[PDB]
Structures are given as structure tokens and as C-alpha cells.
Amino acid sequence: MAKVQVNNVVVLDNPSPFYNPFQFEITFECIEDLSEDLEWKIIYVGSAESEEYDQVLDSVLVGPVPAGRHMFVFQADAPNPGLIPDADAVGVTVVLITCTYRGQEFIRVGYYVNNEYTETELRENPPVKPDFSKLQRNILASNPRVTRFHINWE
């Protein structure tokens, strides 16, 4: 099978203000010594209507990875509201955590994300344009969707 296996992802400070950064505690393991970096990414689905509003919140390389089990904290700044359609701002959307080896995405961990106002005054009379300083991000961490892809591990 694949030479890298993701064991667990923990969503930290999951319910938080929209503008606060994402935090994931990622734990994976590697059957053998790895030649190159593993590239991890966090991708915010700005709009269900088109993938062209995806925002790559961040992209990290974890460098030389031995054959043990490893853990690291993936933190990324919140998406840029100026690229998000107002219609999609409030409601449910998707955030994706992906890992890539030599430019080949081999695993994708996705969560539903609900952006919602917390003051009932705003929930009942939403602003004409989404007020992101008043939105709460809720990553629905109980039920992740994990999708694996076969890549070349040579």
C-alpha cells in the first residue's frame, strides 16, 4: 500500500471566530525512509458553485521524514473574505486537508464547515453583506471524509 498513512486529525479550537486561524493536530506514520518532502495543504472551498474560488490557506513541507510515527500541528490563517461570494459566506462549506508527495496528492481529509452568526439579532436579520468579524466558524469534526488516491512511491 502507500508508504504514508494518516492515523488521526484533531481539530483544535474548532468553534472559533471566522478570522481565527485553522489548527489541526495531524498524526501519520511512514513504513520506510522517505526520499523527499511531504507537502501538506489546507484548502478552503470558497463557493460550492465553482472550484475557482478555492483558497489555499497554506502549504507546508515536512522535509525528511523517518520511518516512525510522527505528529505536527498544521496552522493556517483564515481565508480571505474578499474572494468569497457573499451568497456562500454564511452557511455550510468545505475545508480540505491534503498531503502530496512529489507533486501527487495521495490523501484528502475533508470536513463540513458551518459559518454562522452567534447573536440572534444577526441570525434573524443578516447583514446585506456578510460581516466576517461577527461570523463563527464551526468545523464539524465528528465526521471527516477521507479519500485516498494511488500515487507513485518510487
Binding site: 501538506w40 497554506d58 502549504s59 507546508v60 513541507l61 515536512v62 522535509g63 521524514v65 510522527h70 505528529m71 505536527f72 500541528v73 498544521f74
Partner: peptide
């Protein structure tokens, strides 16, 4: 694009 150390 950014380096991250393992813990």
C-alpha cells in the same frame, strides 16, 4: 512552499 518541522 513553507518548511515545517516534525514534533
Amino acid at each position: 512552499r513553507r518548511q515545517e518541522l516534525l514534533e
